[PDB]
Amino acid sequence: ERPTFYRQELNKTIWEVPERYQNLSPVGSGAYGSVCAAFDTKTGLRVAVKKLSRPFQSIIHAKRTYRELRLLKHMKHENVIGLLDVFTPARSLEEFNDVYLVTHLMGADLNNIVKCQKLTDDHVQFLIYQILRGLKYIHSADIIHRDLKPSNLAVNEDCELKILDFDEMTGYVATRWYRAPEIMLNWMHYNQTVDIWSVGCIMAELLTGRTLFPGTDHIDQLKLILRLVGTPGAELLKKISSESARNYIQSLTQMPKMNFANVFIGANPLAVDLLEKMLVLDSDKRITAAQALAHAYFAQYHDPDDEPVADPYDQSFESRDLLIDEWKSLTYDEVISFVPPP
Ligand SMILES: CCOc1nc(N[C@@H](Cc2ccc3c(c2)COC(C)(C)O3)C(=O)NC)nc(-n2cnc3ccc(C(=O)N4CCCc5ccccc54)cc32)n1
């Protein structure tokens, strides 16, 4: 059952992978691992291989590693990054230290596309549709991304897209320009429609070519947002359980929702309509992914028999308070239990 492993050093790091993976070539200085481009001789696919660094250094990190592996083992969808392989050179649990992950090699993020390319309404349709198809799947598993943004979106030459990666929030930084107001300002217990807000921001950026809410801080970004969508009504104010947040909002001069047709001049009216149903301040009233797939803006791509949902995602491990060795053992279980796609 054991494939033969071989060793090589790639910038002060020993990589031990099965013989099937060839021409390993470093590609990105990550923060939870190093990543190589490789060629998988068995599938004939070009693959990305990640070596998780310090995966079991503390209870926190060992749980994170377990969670990571669980999410990826579970995500089986065309528009969501899943796992072609996972392996360890270790022959037993006692020597088990390293986790390697294998997935499809993707050419660029969406940032590297919207910066370089000029996007027709047709390309925007296909990209957004793909995001929504992936989200419908993610949300059906009771997972919220929380941080959808162009650098989390992998695209290749065919414009095929996959969703990825479910002080750093301070200033004029992309890290915050796509967050929903209620998650950015902790208004309430937020739901999965925070991701729909993010899609709205992304979609707008693809159409206009510029960031929709390039706030220079939390307050400035709120101001940009409300300038477009209007200040909260009485009903939405009730739902903002944070007394600190609610009191601040009421201090602002009230504003009406702007006419979107006047902001995004020249755009497809159907794109304008969809944006209006995505960028609704009240998260309860936002369009869902499943609903957005049926919007007439995607009538050319929409396929109700080819927009699948997810298997039950057993997430009950989150409540668990275990020791390092116990998370690591559960991780090892998920490693050896892995069955590749057909
Ligand atoms: C750490 C990032 O470093 C990095 N740099 C480059 N550089 C490319 C250009 C480029 C630049 C940015 C960029 C993309 C490309 C593609 O989409 C995204 C959004 C990544 O952004 C280049 O120079 N090619 C010449 N490519 C990649 N990469 C390429 N396919 C990847 C697939 C997944 C991931 C991954 O993170 N996971 C995480 C969990 C799942 C998993 C499982 C196994 C392995 C990695 C992973 C990384 C990938 N990662």
Side-chain angles (χ1 to χ4, degrees), residues 145-160:
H145 195 291
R146 290 176 194 91
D147 203 18
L148 255 189
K149 50 181 166 147
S151 64
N152 276 335
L153 300 170
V155 289
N156 55 39
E157 302 67 26
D158 292 41
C159 282
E160 274 159 5

Side-chain angles (χ1 to χ4, degrees), residues 27 52 62 70 94 121 129 135 176 181 220 237 249 256 264 276:
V27 91
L52 307 192
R70 285 295 308 280
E94 311 88 71
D121 190 64
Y129 172 77
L135 274 179
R176 199 196 60 246
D220 181 60
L237 279 161
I249 281 145
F264 309 97
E276 269 175 335

Side-chain angles (χ1 to χ4, degrees), residues 27-31 33 35-37 48-50 68 72 81-83 101-110 150-155 164-165:
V27 91
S29 329
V35 181
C36 287
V49 186
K50 184 172 192 176
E68 189 153 357
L72 300 167
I81 271 130
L83 224 42
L101 305 165
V102 187
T103 198
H104 296 283
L105 191 58
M106 309 295 291
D109 59 25
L110 193 69
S151 64
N152 276 335
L153 300 170
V155 289
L164 170 137
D165 236 43

